[PDB]
Amino acid sequence: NKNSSYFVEWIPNNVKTAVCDIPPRGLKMSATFIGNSTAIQELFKRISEQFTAMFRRKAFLHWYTGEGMDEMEFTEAESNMNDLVSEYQQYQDATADEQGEFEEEGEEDEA
């Protein structure tokens, strides 16, 4: 309620509760958080630019090709991480309002 801006709007009521009777040894009570946010875009955003910083210049790469890997694979790992950061950014702040194909049928015309 006080943090409506921090939830995605087309998954309703974004919480999984669960309660155990038994606390961790040496704590009278505790809770565990597992949160799934768009915010993780940040990880894949930083790592895929640092990765293009490397493979764009074949830097550090002779050590790995030198074990039987190929340049196609660096491209496919990259292709996918860039695709992946584009999927998390597609859903970063994605509407509960309809998405796309906004075209229509007209009015009847004199003959």
Binding site: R56, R57, K58
Partner: protein, 48 residues
């Protein structure tokens, strides 16, 4: 008396053909050929 002819024996009068003569010196320098040479790392074309 008469001596007709007499001369000295033997020194600088018998040397007058042989100087001896001198010579000529030269260096002692070369180059190397650079025409084969290119850098041995080489990633910047990968911009392609």
């Amino acid at each position: 008396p008469d001596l007709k002819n007499v001369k000295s024996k033997i020194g600088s009068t018998e040397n007058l053909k042989h100087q001896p003569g001198g010579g000529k010196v030269q260096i002692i320098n070369k180059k190397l050929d650079l025409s084969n040479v290119q850098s041995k790392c080489g990633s910047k074309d990968n911009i392609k």
